[PDB]
Backbone:
């Protein structure tokens, strides 16, 4: 006769969803002076994080079911919006613009400011990008801001930063994160090299389109993951084993004017350019890009055919879909990126100040003018591809970019209490 | 799960040598380590083993008071400490891991690359 | 542990049958580990508890025997197997290995 | 046969060893704006999980015990496997899933058939 | 408002402190005891003072500070060397 | 020319009411009762205060 016995501390778990919390590096605590994501309201990371490799644990993973992506979706948007609550409405500035060309990507516009200094009116001028404003059809000399008839746009408070600090996300007590350490593992299915993680590595909240950058290189080969590689409704995520260097710049030493439009209220606008007008652009090593791209094809052809023609020029969607984009030095560049795919490298880039947190509903944020020149560089580490076997760059939203990193982990809940039959009866 | 040993050494008789072995890819304290030596022309000589968790060791009678093992878990590293070196101590010093199923030796499938000591 | 092994010059051809014998005066019951070693390399395990084949070790390797007398058989010898072979005895310690035998070219 | 072992891995998921072997590390497992909201909820959940296990151990009279035996016999209708088949040939992760549907049954039996009944019998005996 | 936050955090902290002590007493098998003895011997390397020197000539405020750095050591020893080991031995004895 | 000023709602009072501050369970406040104690250093007449 076997008897019921209770065992506590049983090493089992069930898959579960909970909230992960942030953990900061060291510096982020004191970056509150400007940085939105690198907040002071965040505990530190573990200076000596542990990891345990499990011997016989094999589990199913599915990156497209990874709920951590939703948490990152909401957190970035919420934090970004919170930081803009005290910022300046540009509503009264949309009233009028009399424009000529800058002495036409950039317009030199004069304007009439409505009662400002209590009982006074004033006139000013500023430089505007053609991507932020549009002409009046029956004038062709007068302009308005594009988003004015839908919603409010504010100018980010000058004391702001979006530096993409690699914040870590940690599980609460009672929970653990299991990591798939199988370098050849695709987006779904079983993984045998599994380890227990209490907290993940830091992930930079990088915002970009048509580019995976500044992290997560592949294990000495191009690694491609997709929900199917079959269905045209699905997309392909490409990891490179080597990064490709890109150097971007906006070589215009610009200044900015503070315009007061009433006592107690003001905003900044692009002022005069110190020096000549230089085109924003980015330098991509051609050989590295195309040598890598040849290697990408070597991996891609495994699913799509050995003589299959792949990788054509960007096409489809509006200019923010078609052009490649990033915040270089905080400045927003929209690059044609067709040279990279002009065969199945320096690109021109355009500048725009009205931006979305990936995509807003109605509202938008205005990027204050930046004094001086823009210089930055980065590591190209991957691609997202569009099915047509022609592939084109782009597609998806922030969750596809978050997923491209989060695919390594899943969350489980520890279930330590259970029973089993024994030969031992309770004594009384 | 791999074992990584330090470099080679040249010593004169009466000297001592210390050979490290790092626990890469596995928990240092989760699997006891053996030390085995192979002098030129020789088969495999067991020297002893160390428990990376507790510091417990067992050594061959041949080396009582001569071969010692130590560990420092903060760097996931075990060490072989050999004194009174003589010409018979020329050889390859290897670190290795067993399965220890049931906490008893089974056979060792994970080996370091071995380092040489010349005496 | 008081182990006697087969003559070291165990010549064989590829696809041939070569065996290594490990017979000790002391019993281990089954607590014997079979190893394969190349010059310049650490020895590695083939068979444990005198009969369990380690995953990753080719199916051509098998072993029989008990108590004191164990034999390692390579049923279809390949070029990569022209290695030395050892037994380690675990009834007690020191857990030394035998002198080792070698498979030679026929 | 040389006793080399007694080492520490950490975590020890119930796949790496059998239920019997796994039971040797119960102490191991035991040892193991919006930001405010998250800090709060995280702490609340940790408390809730902790207490739920303690509440069950409490009512069963198994508080403070890694292992406790009850007055309730095993019913083969829950599982007809032998002691060996359960403890030596299976790990907890696989095995518990087979009787997951009897959890509330057994938990209830070990409360009323054991402590309510045992304590009433003993209280009465102690009045003499 | 902010008052709610303070009432909340204050109550949360009180709970956390209470449970931390209970969690340790729980794992040690010392729950419900003001005083409990363990299976682990005192090591003079932690303190080489005599019983009298510790108990009759010192108060807790001064004395505990001297072994503050051995807290995790001892706490760990009294868990595994005592309850994991004691309970496994007793469970097996009770199957007979 | 710098900021917004509002008129306090007529139904307002700033009467400086002597509100007490209390410690949560697990905490205590120690008070220095030494009438000659300066701003820093040791105090021997010490008492335990919850609030
Ligand atoms: C991919 O990774 C690359 C780098 O690996 C990132 O690009 C760099 O990002 C950092 C952070 O955003 C940039 O840092 C900026 O450097 C400017 C110049 O630095 C020089 O001068 C300062 C003067 O004191 C020296 O301290 C410093 O050592 C250098 O000599 C600074 O001026 C910038 O400061 C900004 O914020 C302060 C805050 O108040 C303002 O006052 C400043 O006016 C200014 O706004 C800042 O420190 C760096 O320049 C970037 N480029 C390069 C080439 O490194 C990519 O952004 C990253 N991409 C992604 C998507 O992650
Ligand atoms: C991951 O999951 C696998 C699942 O199988 C676990 O596998 C364990 O593997 C070990 C060894 O590989 C097993 O432990 C040993 O089993 C031996 C049983 O016999 C074999 O050898 C004889 C020799 O003639 C054969 O006749 C027989 O058919 C078998 O081939 C025992 O002999 C071993 O010694 C121990 O047990 C015996 C009996 O209890 C005692 O005599 C010894 O004193 C010593 O206690 C040893 O038991 C183990 O049983 C397998 N597990 C299961 C559930 O089957 C992996 O271990 C697991 N984890 C890891 C880390 O990989
Ligand atoms: C499960 O995942 C585990 C984690 O990735 C795997 O462990 C990894 O196994 C590989 C096997 O090759 C190891 O790779 C080797 O690493 C050594 C390290 O030495 C060098 O780097 C150190 C860093 O400080 C430096 O100090 C040294 O001087 C060297 O420069 C390299 O030399 C080898 O060439 C090779 O790269 C991984 O390191 C190891 N990971 C860890 C964390 O140790 C495990 O094998 C996986 N298991 C399965 C079944 O897949
Ligand atoms: C983009 O690619 C460049 C080039 O590979 C990356 O720069 C490299 O970053 C690593 C970071 O560890 C530097 O390593 C350094 O090693 C020395 C060794 O002692 C150490 O002291 C330093 O603290 C540091 O670890 C490496 O030198 C550096 N390479 C160059 C040429 O500077 C860059 O980090 C990549 N960017 C991203 C976002 O991945
Ligand atoms: C991307 O690559 C292009 C070239 O492949 C870089 O263009 C270079 O820009 C600099 C500055 O405008 C040019 O400097 C000029 O050199 C002449 C030489 O006599 C001098 O007289 C001028 O006063 C000035 O110094 C440089 O020549 C030009 N290179 C070429 C080949 O035209 C561009 O700067 C790169 N961009 C980035 C972000 O690195
Ligand atoms: C503000 O009103 C103008 C028209 O009065 C809108 O312009 C339209 O923009 C869409 C965008 O694809 C075009 O297809 C339409 O043809 C445009 N209308 C005209 C008459 O050309 C503008 O979109 C409105 N602004 C917002 C933010 O909705
Ligand atoms: C991956 O591709 C397969 C290919 O068959 C998908 O199967 C679909 O099955 C339904 C069943 O009637 C068909 O009507 C569809 O046309 C099939 N799709 C295609 C592309 O042919 C499967 O659903 C796809 N899985 C994912 C994740 O997209
Ligand atoms: C714009 O400038 C031209 C320059 O002559 C002027 O004639 C025109 O009236 C101006 N329009 C507005 C709206 O001020
Ligand atoms: C991942 O590879 C496994 C291999 O069998 C396959 O079954 C699974 O469908 C693949 N999943 C994806 C998304 O490629
Ligand atoms: C970017 O500038 C750095 C400066 O040293 C240079 O080394 C690197 O090659 C440049 N990258 C490209 C793509 O030109």
Residues:
């Amino acid at each position: 006769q076997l008897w019921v016995t209770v065992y506590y501390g049983v090493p089992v778990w069930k898959e579960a969803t909970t909230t992960l919390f942030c953990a900061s590096d060291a510096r982020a605590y004191d970056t509150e002076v400007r940085n939105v994501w690198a907040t002071h309201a965040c505990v530190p990371t573990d200076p000596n994080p542990q990891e345990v490799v499990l011997e016989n644990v094999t589990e199913n993973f599915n990156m497209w079911k990874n709920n951590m992506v939703e948490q990152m979706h909401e957190d970035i948007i919420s934090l970004w919006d919170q930081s803009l609550k005290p910022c300046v409405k540009l509503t009264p500035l949309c009233v009028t613009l009399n424009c000529t060309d800058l002495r036409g990507e950039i317009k030199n516009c004069s304007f009439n400011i409505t009662t400002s200094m209590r009982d006074k009116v004033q006139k000013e001028y500023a430089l505007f990008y053609k991507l932020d404003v549009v002409p009046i059809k029956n004038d062709n000399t007068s302009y308005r801001l594009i988003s004015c008839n839908t919603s409010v746009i504010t100018q980010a408070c000058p004391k702001v930063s979006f530096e993409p600090i690699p914040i870590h996300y940690c599980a609460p007590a009672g929970f653990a994160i299991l990591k798939c350490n199988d370098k050849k593992f695709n987006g779904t299915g079983p993984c045998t090299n599994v380890s227990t993680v209490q907290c993940t590595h830091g992930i930079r909240p990088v915002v970009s389109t048509q580019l995976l950058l500044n992290g997560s290189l592949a294990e000495e080969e191009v690694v491609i993951r997709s929900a199917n590689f079959t269905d045209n409704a699905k997309i392909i995520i490409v990891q490179l084993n080597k990064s490709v260097e890109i150097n971007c710049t906006r070589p215009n030493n610009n200044t900015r004017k503070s315009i007061h439009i009433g006592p107690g209220r003001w905003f900044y606008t692009t002022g005069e350019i110190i020096g000549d007008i230089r085109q924003a652009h980015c330098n991509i090593s051609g050989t590295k890009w195309n040598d890598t791209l040849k290697q990408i094809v070597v991996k891609l052809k495994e699913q799509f055919g050995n003589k299959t023609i792949v990788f054509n020029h960007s096409s489809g969607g509006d200019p923010e879909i078609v052009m490649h984009s990033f915040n270089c030095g905080g400045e927003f560049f929209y690059c044609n990126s067709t040279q990279l795919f002009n065969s199945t490298i320096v690109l021109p880039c355009r500048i725009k100040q009205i931006v979305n947190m990936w995509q807003e509903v109605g509202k938008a944020m205005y990027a204050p003018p930046i004094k001086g020149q823009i210089r930055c560089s980065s590591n190209i580490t991957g691609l997202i591809l569009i099915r047509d076997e022609i592939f084109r760059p782009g597609g998806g939203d922030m969750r596809d970019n978050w997923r491209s990193e989060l695919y390594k982990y899943k969350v489980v809940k520890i279930e330590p209490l259970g029973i089993a039959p024994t030969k031992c009866k309770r004594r009384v | 799960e791999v074992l990584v040993q330090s470099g080679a050494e040249v010593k004169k008789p009466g000297a001592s040598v210390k050979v490290s072995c790092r626990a890469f890819g596995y928990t240092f304290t989760g699997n006891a380590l053996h030390w085995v030596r192979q002098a030129p022309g020789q088969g495999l000589e067991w020297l002893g083993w160390i428990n990376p968790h507790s510091g417990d060791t067992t050594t061959s009678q041949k080396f009582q008071g001569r071969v010692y093992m130590t560990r420092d878990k903060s760097i996931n590293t075990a060490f072989l400490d050999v004194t009174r070196l003589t010409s018979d101590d020329t050889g390859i010093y290897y670190c290795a891991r067993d399965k220890y199923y049931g906490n008893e030796a089974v056979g060792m499938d994970v080996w370091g690359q071995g380092t040489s000591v010349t005496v | 542990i008081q182990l006697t092994q087969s003559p070291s010059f165990l010549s064989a051809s590829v696809g041939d049958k070569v065996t290594i014998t490990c017979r000790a005066s002391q019993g281990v019951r089954n607590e014997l580990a079979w190893y394969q070693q190349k010059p310049g390399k650490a020895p590695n395990l083939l068979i444990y508890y005198a009969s369990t084949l380690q995953s990753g070790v080719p199916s051509r390797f098998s072993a029989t025997g008990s108590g004191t007398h164990f034999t390692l058989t390579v049923s279809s010898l390949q070029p990569e197997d022209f290695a030395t072979y050892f037994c380690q005895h675990m009834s007690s310690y020191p857990l030394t290995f035998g002198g080792g035998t070698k498979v030679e070219i026929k | 046969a040389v006793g080399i072992g007694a080492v520490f891995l950490g975590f020890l998921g119930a796949a790496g060893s059998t239920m019997g072997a796994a039971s040797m590390t119960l102490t191991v497992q035991a040892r193991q704006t919006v930001w405010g909201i998250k800090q709060l909820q995280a702490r609340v959940l940790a408390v809730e999980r902790y207490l739920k296990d303690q509440q069950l151990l409490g009512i069963w009279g198994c508080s403070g015990k890694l292992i406790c035996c009850t007055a309730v016999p095993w019913n083969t209708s829950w599982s007809n496997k032998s002691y060996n088949q359960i403890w030596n040939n299976m790990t907890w992760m696989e095995w518990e899933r087979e009787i997951d549907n009897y959890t509330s049954l057994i938990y209830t039996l070990i409360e009323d058939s054991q402590n309510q009944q045992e304590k009433n019998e003993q209280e009465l005996l102690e009045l003499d």
